[PDB]
Design a protein around this ligand. Structure first.
Ligand SMILES: CSC[C@H]1O[C@@H](n2cnc3c(N)ncnc32)[C@H](O)[C@@H]1O
Ligand SMILES: CSC[C@H]1O[C@@H](n2cnc3c(N)ncnc32)[C@H](O)[C@@H]1O
Ligand SMILES: [K+]
Ligand SMILES: [K+]
Ligand SMILES: [Mg+2]
Ligand SMILES: [Mg+2]
Ligand code: NA
Ligand code: NA
Ligand code: NA
Ligand code: NA
Lengths: 380, 380
């Protein structure tokens, strides 16, 4: 009756995550001045380079040099010895206006509530009662391991740490009438960029004692748990120098860690009219509302859109057998309680607010009581 | 008992797909000369620009200008009137060697069969008996609609078509003891870039009569089917000019269209040591082998790895209730019949062969009898 499931997370300095954070720093900078900015900002990172490419139509005056460099500073890349330095790297900009053909078909001369979806696409939300925050334990633990690394880097207790990290957690679960129950941690991987001086044994001991034991409850760890700590043996070169980064290349880290499903679209760098983001946030909100409302223990929600059309083309509910109500009944409850037009989601979830950089590391869900994490009280 | 499910596909000229195809053209060019090339080539596209960024260590001598421009030519962007021209666009290259720290931890001085995984990560394979090729009908139809557009563009019967397109198909299904049975097509979306002269009514009529009816069996279409054809109303600006493209931004189009699951890693531009690709191909091979072997009607396979470690850290089988055998029994069959070390997968699936550009549009699975699509006969 038991099975394994694995999820990963990455740190703030993983090169793809750098790009997500920069893209959302750009979005936030625009929204601070123009709440209706149309933003589709992709970021690419390689040795010494941040490139911004995409489409922005906005009344804001944004200093891209400053915004990019401040984001990199916050992440911690502040010296050539670390492989990347916000003070001295190249920032290149290839940004144009939003296509007028898109604008006319999506939002021009439309009532805000009746704005069209900014694109076609499909999106999923997911929730599971296995944690209070309604997220899979595998990814929660993986994120917290990366957060702990950043904490110990920033507080100076492990000064050999650098910002680029990856973690991976395999949990053994039991099945429980469609719900899942975590039993134990089967395997943990941690890889983190480090300075030239620290030895492998010092790092592996610190990762076990000061990172894993600080994060993972002892009840989940036992004599059989497998640890792969600095498994490559050496990780001095890191950040964009070690591996090119791009926005939207961590979409499973950003969401459910392999659980649930994904429609494919990236979140970062996009304003609310891009339903890839807003409708995925709304679908999470629906899923979490169903679980916290006691209607089911685990649920997957699909929605889809066509460019220029406000109402979703399809809505689907999959409850894994964890409700007394049928999926059809849950779908009817959802349709009676939620309006998933993007021009309504923006109001319900306050999606013109410049909080997006905060979403761009450690997952978009299960944290911080963002609006999509506050369940809606359902009438049925 | 019925539900809706939606999947999308994109055409060869969608800007993200352009990048996937270029990344895999670069990979193939290296593999033609050096079967052991280490390749991690990301591509970015915006108005007038293809940028290559990443890491390649190879004995090949590759003319990146030629390889990139030939790929864009094949896609069909050959004139400024179409928004992009292989003859005149900018090709910029930011390629460095593979990090020596990665190389030493993954493959240097290792027996090929015992090469480490090139990264940590998780990967999924999926198969469903609802089509002969063991793929979801929603995405099969979505891909075929894009292929039909390209066919009618290239044969001159719809000369107003351009290469950038997106499609989306919503199917109504019945549940059948964990398997799924397609009933009818509920909604179809098609958006395709077009010339300045053709009118909306001509396009919508052609898309219904010459594209949809040519692709979708009439038995699935009825008076209730909803058609969103050129729903934005105008799509003259397209390709990278309309929307920036990046490699690895169509990972759900590349795989199962929202069905199954995804571990997050992109395929294109990566040689076999990157388990994001090779282990996902192997997991598809496992899933399809289980379904074609009669052991189940629908199955999801998870595998995961740590950088530098050859054997997977976890393997999991989820059969949706579609087998008489337990998931544990299927897992034991898989473990007895498959060796999922990357240095064995490469031999079984012939992954040094330069066929990767062929995988980079219309999905990596369900087509062309690639090695991962030829089931393994299972002993149990
Ligand atoms: C293996 S390259 C993909 C990711 O793995 C990490 N990485 C880079 N170099 C190493 C290394 N030497 N050892 C382990 N992980 C690494 C970085 O987070 C990078 O973005
Ligand atoms: C809306 S931008 C995202 C994708 O949608 C497509 N697209 C671009 N412009 C339009 C348009 N005017 N109408 C419909 N789809 C478009 C292109 O495939 C692009 O990559
Ligand atoms: K990369
Ligand atoms: K884009
Ligand atoms: Mg990456
Ligand atoms: Mg895209
Ligand atoms: Na274990
Ligand atoms: Na819509
Ligand atoms: Na319909
Ligand atoms: Na491994």
């Amino acid at each position: 009756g038991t099975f394994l499931f694995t999820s990963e997370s990455v740190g703030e300095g993983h090169p793809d995550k750098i790009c997500d954070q920069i893209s959302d720093a750009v979005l936030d900078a625009h929204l601070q001045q123009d709440p209706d900015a149309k933003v589709a900002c992709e970021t690419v990172a390689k040795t010494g380079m941040i490139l911004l490419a995409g489409e922005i139509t906005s009344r804001a005056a944004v200093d891209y040099q400053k915004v990019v460099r401040e984001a990199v500073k916050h992440i911690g890349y502040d010296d050539s010895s670390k492989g990347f330095d916000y003070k001295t790297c190249n920032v290149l900009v290839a940004l144009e206006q939003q296509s007028p053909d898109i604008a006319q078909g999506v939002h021009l001369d439309r009532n805000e509530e009746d704005i069209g979806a900014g694109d076609q696409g499909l999106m999923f939300g997911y929730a599971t009662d296995e944690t209070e925050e309604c997220m899979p334990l595998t990814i929660v633990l993986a994120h917290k391991l990366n957060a702990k690394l950043a904490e110990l880097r920033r507080n100076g207790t492990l000064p050999w740490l650098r910002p680029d990290s990856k973690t991976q957690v395999t949990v053994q679960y039991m099945q429980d009438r469609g719900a899942v129950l975590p039993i134990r941690v089967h395997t943990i991987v941690i890889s983190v960029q480090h300075d030239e001086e620290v030895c492998l044994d010092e790092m592996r001991d610190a990762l076990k004692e000061k990172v894993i034991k600080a994060v993972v409850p002892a009840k989940y760890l036992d004599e059989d748990t497998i640890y792969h700590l600095q498994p490559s043996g050496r990780f001095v070169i890191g950040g964009p120098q070690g591996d090119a980064g791009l926005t939207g290349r961590k979409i499973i880290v950003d969401t459910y860690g392999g659980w649930g499903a994904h429609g494919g679209g990236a979140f970062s760098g996009k304003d609310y009219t891009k339903v890839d983001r807003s409708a995925a946030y709304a679908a999470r909100w629906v899923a979490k509302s169903l679980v916290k409302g006691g209607l089911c223990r685990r649920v997957l929600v699909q929605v889809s859109y066509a460019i220029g059309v406000s109402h979703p083309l399809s809505i689907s509910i999959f409850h894994y057998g964890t409700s007394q109500k049928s999926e059809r009944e849950l779908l009817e409850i959802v349709k009676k309680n939620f309006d998933l037009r993007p021009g309504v989601i923006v109001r319900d979830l306050d999606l013109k607010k410049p909080i997006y950089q905060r979403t761009a590391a450690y997952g978009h869900f299960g944290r911080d009581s963002f609006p999509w994490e506050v369940p809606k009280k359902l009438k049925y």
